Ligand binder design. Structure first.
Ligand SMILES: OC[C@@H](O)[C@H](O)[C@@H](O)CO
Ligand SMILES: OC[C@@H](O)[C@H](O)[C@@H](O)CO
Lengths: 728, 303, 304
């Protein structure tokens, strides 16, 4: 039906915009799943064929795919897309690169200071991409079966700029992202530091005292033997044996974390395997029949069924019995294997499967293992260099990853290692982290790189605590988005061009992104101007009325406008009619919120669906009427904030309320904001006085702008312009 | 040399002079074709201004009023009138802001910060409009001088500056629309009153004469070579100058020594963006600060 | 030739294409029937309207099933086909490798408008004689992007007048016209004078053209063709012989504002040289920096 053969090729028209292309020397084509591809079942589509003696052409709504017979070459296999996004980059040639690809992601940010190259994704400004399937075939139950009989196997995506549908159909082909568990979406604490049981528990209790919520307790490699390992074994990098001086009763320690409602993960460095000094070695040496008198190591070999079984049952098994919830797979030792399968892919695939025996919807934490490895969340980007350049790369890196379906990157918030101390960098990084897929604080082995908020001065500490509480207020919104990724193939973090594919400005704001469906984020990733005592970012406001999510400062779209914020504030925006649910009790240890705040932005209708473990709740705003209903009844108490004011507090059940009488306006006003920006600025008092007096006295908006245009401080002009623009 | 001549024409006396160097002649044809033609145009303009200059001379001698006045003589209570050292009133009808700094080579234009008192002002040469009160950086090519007239200004010009006549046989009355106005031309042996009241222009004189009067109302010559005292209704006629934003924007981008990609983007975005405030927002993103201020002057005149 | 085109019905009938599926006649210059349809049914009607020759503007790569560069197939076959229209006809197309001088004229394409691009171009042009490609037509004043500078446009036109071909061209900007009256009176007049000079030089150029064709001598020669044993002949990259009677040293850098003059270091071979325009004399052999106003170009002739 949707399968055509010609010469030694097979073409499957999976959708009008997706064509599998195979070559076979043997006349046998591959039906089995691959490391990448999990499903080729798609509903029948319409297309046309022009088949001649020596040529075939397959025509869809969006592509002409041509094959002239013989071996696949740039001349024998090519395609024209039925778009005009470019004058002459509308042709795919087999084995050739074309321009327009919007990129995807890469294995890691290990040792990266700022930007690094990315792999291609499936999204292109010019409307097509090819995704080579170079992976091994799988058995029915998901084991490596060997080499595909399709010796060339490609997917041609020709979705134009319908990026969302491209990603949806990629997830249909490669398997949806599984559901995260709610616990993964809260704050994680991590540090490469030789904590004892006592010192780690004291820190967790200090987080509680300081009003910082946490969901995960990471224990880095100093949980296991390091310096005690005799040198004949090699290093202490790999370990499976508790340091009993630091953790004299591991099961008790983990029970203590469990009693604090924390999930626990240990660092695993797998590459040196199970050597003869290890606590599990006698059991593993028995199972794998090793020579114990010659201290024969169980060398790491994830190609080997018996090794994997010993690793899961006899090495992880006892640690999981002590209470370890999930595994931080920390692989930095290369891509070499006899099978030709990346050991990182084998670890992620097999550990993610094994993790589901411990807990429902369990996770791992591991580096990116290529297309399809979004099936094994979470992503771990690794050893970023602590720099402004690294932070400036990170928003772009994160949204761009959605172009290959890898939507759960966990970055070391505040960066991993080396680089330079700057409290303002640490605070900006946490701001981004809170509005990123996962908020995991982590640092390398320095005495000087703790991400503890109280490491910093009173201003930085308070702002960090505020943002860390905000992350937990956002867990309902994150969890709902998580269920949407798993069920409908929509990323939490989208580049602007997913929503605005035809706006040139949607390609010109690398670090700006949609965060779920209700929020638009423009993180500040550059050090402040000391003259203004504010940092800035150029923001593109799409057509419509926008508000600062925090302040209610208004912006009339469509405009590109430099926006300025103190180091303690982040640019996050919501449209007229936006509805955002918040946990009213972020510090309370509840499996699901007892109380939701409904934050409503006035000036249009809107709608929000809060998806939960065992409910759906619909919030509707239609002609000033706010209505909450749910699929199931519950004791939940709902609070409504309309623009500035709390309207209803702690109201139970379903309900409908008229907000047409109430104040739609936010307090945010030009005069107050002007005074604040002049007051903090490190500029002459004569300039502050003159600006305040003139902008108060001059009434016409165009003459207020003419007054600021004469200011010799170009950045002060831009800061004052933002206020006048918001105040027009 | 050209900027200095522009000032000299709008100064009490226009005397070209140089020291003994073989290289310092002020002869216009000492300079290239562009400079030569602009100098000749300004030198002809000086003779066109002689009626206005001679009248102000008789006013200095009879009423103790200077031809050239600091801004604070007319605006003693405005702080901006003390902050524009080189800006002045030139008789009663004209306000001059000479450019006295070398051009920005990236713009191919010089500039001066002009204070526009409350009122509607027009560039005397181009009719480019400005809504006072504002302080505004204005940009001109080296061949153009910032000289302004209010709505209702009336300036007499000798129609025949090259003809050797003890008094002009022909006067052009140049009228700036949008308000009432009055000019009294004092001469050796006459006084002529030009009045503009609810769109009625009337010329009278204490004595009759063979003088022929030309009238220019904003852009357009209405009456050529009309003798004797008369009245004409200008309410029917086009009040608007041709000056327009689109033409001026194209010229400023076209002369500028900037990237063609920047010229293309500015022309496209200022053509496409309809709302004035969003046109200003667009120019506020431009990395060239003086280019912003030049485009801002055009957007401010075009508001 | 796609289904919307005026010639499509005739081409679709000739090549047996499925018109209800809007099957294109895809570019295939390896294919005898495609070429015949291209020349007879696509170019043919346009030539009957009066088109004299074809500007082949190929920027789509070197892929063909034969392994032959499509640019080479286009230049070869279109040059041959052009001779049916007019005696000694031309094309205008990019260089297709050694031997493609048989298909004049060269078309260098989408240069960036810059002092850098001008400063490379005389060297590029004379160096091309070393593979026999003696008829490069550059976009005079540059093609695209880059920066406005009326002096750059004027220096570029001075060079073009003393280049194999003088073709004014620009990209799609409202701002990049090469019309002389785009510029101020001084620049406009100089441009008009240089454009007149190109036509004054056609007898010289046409005579040198017949010499290229009959005797294998380039119009534009690197200095080392005449002076192979003079080290200075390898050290003046933008200096060249322009036919047998003139030596050109184009100025390719912005003037020194203090002098109001541009300059180039000229090597004068042994003998007495004169500025072709002014008669200013120079005793060779010497290396001398020479200075010209933006309206004047260094071109020299020997006594006799
Ligand atoms: O186990 C120590 C490691 O260096 C970790 O701290 C890194 O985060 C791994 O990428
Ligand atoms: O047809 C438009 C092209 O861009 C031409 O203008 C170039 O000169 C080709 O190289």
């Amino acid at each position: 039906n949707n399968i055509i053969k010609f010469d030694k090729a097979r073409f499957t028209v999976l959708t009008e915009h997706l064509i599998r292309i195979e070559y076979s020397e043997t006349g046998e084509f591959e039906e089995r799943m691959t490391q990448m591809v999990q499903n080729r079942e798609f509903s029948e589509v319409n297309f046309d064929i022009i088949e001649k003696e020596e040529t075939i052409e397959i025509i869809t709504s969006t592509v002409h795919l041509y094959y002239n017979g013989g071996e696949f070459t740039n001349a024998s296999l090519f395609a024209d897309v039925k778009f005009n996004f470019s004058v002459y980059s509308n042709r795919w040639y087999f084995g050739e690169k074309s321009d327009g690809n919007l990129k995807g992601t890469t294995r890691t940010l290990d040792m990266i200071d700022g930007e690094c190259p990315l792999e291609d994704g499936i999204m292109s400004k010019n409307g097509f991409a090819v995704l080579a399937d170079k992976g091994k075939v799988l058995t029915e139950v998901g084991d490596i079966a060997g080499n595909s009989v399709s010796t060339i196997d490609l997917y041609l995506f020709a979705y134009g700029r319908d990026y969302r549908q491209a990603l949806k159909d990629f997830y249909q082909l490669t398997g949806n992202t599984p559901k995260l568990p709610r616990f993964a979406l809260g704050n994680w604490w991590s540090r490469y530091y030789d904590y004892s049981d006592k010192s780690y528990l004291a820190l967790m209790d200090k987080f509680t005292d300081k009003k910082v919520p946490l969901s995960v307790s990471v224990i880095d490699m100093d949980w296991h033997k390091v310096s005690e390992v005799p040198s004949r074994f090699g290093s202490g990098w790999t370990g499976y044996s508790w340091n009993k001086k630091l953790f004299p009763n591991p099961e008790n320690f983990i029970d203590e974390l469990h009693q604090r409602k924390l999930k626990v993960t240990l660092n695993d460095h797998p590459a040196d395997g199970i050597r003869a000094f290890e606590d599990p070695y006698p059991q593993v040496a028995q199972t794998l029949d090793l020579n114990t008198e010659l201290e024969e190591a169980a060398k790491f070999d994830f190609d080997n069924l018996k090794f994997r079984k010993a690793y899961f049952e006899e090495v992880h098994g006892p640690l999981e019995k002590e209470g370890v919830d999930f595994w931080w797979i920390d692989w930095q030792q290369g891509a070499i294997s006899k099978s030709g399968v990346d050991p990182l892919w084998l670890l992620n695939h097999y550990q993610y499967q094994n993790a589901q025996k411990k807990h429902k919807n369990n996770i791992i934490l591991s580096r990116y293992a290529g297309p399809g490895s979004h099936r094994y969340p979470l992503g771990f980007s690794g050893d970023s260099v602590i720099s402004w350049a690294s932070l400036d790369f990170q928003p772009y890196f994160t949204s761009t990853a959605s172009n290959i379906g890898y939507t759960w990157w966990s970055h070391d918030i505040g960066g991993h290692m080396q680089g330079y101390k700057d409290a303002e960098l640490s605070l900006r990084w946490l701001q981004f982290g809170v509005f990123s897929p996962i908020n995991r604080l982590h640092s390398s082995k320095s005495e000087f790189t703790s991400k503890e908020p109280w490491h910093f001065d009173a201003v930085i500490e308070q702002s960090m605590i505020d943002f860390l509480q905000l992350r937990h207020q956002l867990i309902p919104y994150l969890y709902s988005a998580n269920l949407i990724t798993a069920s409908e193939g929509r990323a939490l973090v989208e580049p602007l061009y997913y929503e605005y594919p035809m706006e040139e400005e949607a390609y010109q704001h690398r670090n700006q992104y949609l965060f779920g469906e209700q929020l638009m984020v423009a993180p500040i990733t550059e050090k402040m101007n000391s003259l203004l005592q504010m940092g800035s970012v150029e923001v593109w406001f799409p057509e419509g009325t926008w508000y600062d999510f925090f302040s209610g400062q208004p912006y009339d779209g469509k405009v590109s406008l430099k926006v300025y914020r103190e180091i303690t504030e982040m640019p996050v925006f919501a449209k007229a009619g936006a509805i955002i649910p918040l946990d009213k009790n972020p510090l309370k240890k509840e499996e699901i919120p007892s109380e939701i705040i409904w934050k409503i932005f006035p000036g249009a209708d809107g709608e929000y669906l809060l998806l939960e473990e065992d409910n759906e709740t619909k919030a509707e705003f239609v002609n000033g009427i706010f209505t909450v209903t749910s699929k199931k009844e519950s004791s939940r108490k709902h609070t409504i904030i309309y623009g500035e004011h709390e309207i209803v507090s702690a109201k139970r059940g379903e309900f409908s309320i008229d907000l047409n009488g109430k104040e739609e306006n936010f307090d945010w006003n030009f005069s107050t904001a002007l005074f604040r920006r002049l007051d903090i600025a490190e500029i002459s008092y004569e300039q502050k006085d003159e600006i305040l007096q003139q902008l108060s006295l001059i009434e016409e908006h165009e003459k207020q702008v003419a007054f600021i245009k004469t200011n010799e401080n170009q950045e002060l002009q831009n800061s004052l312009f933002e206020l006048l623009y918001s105040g027009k």
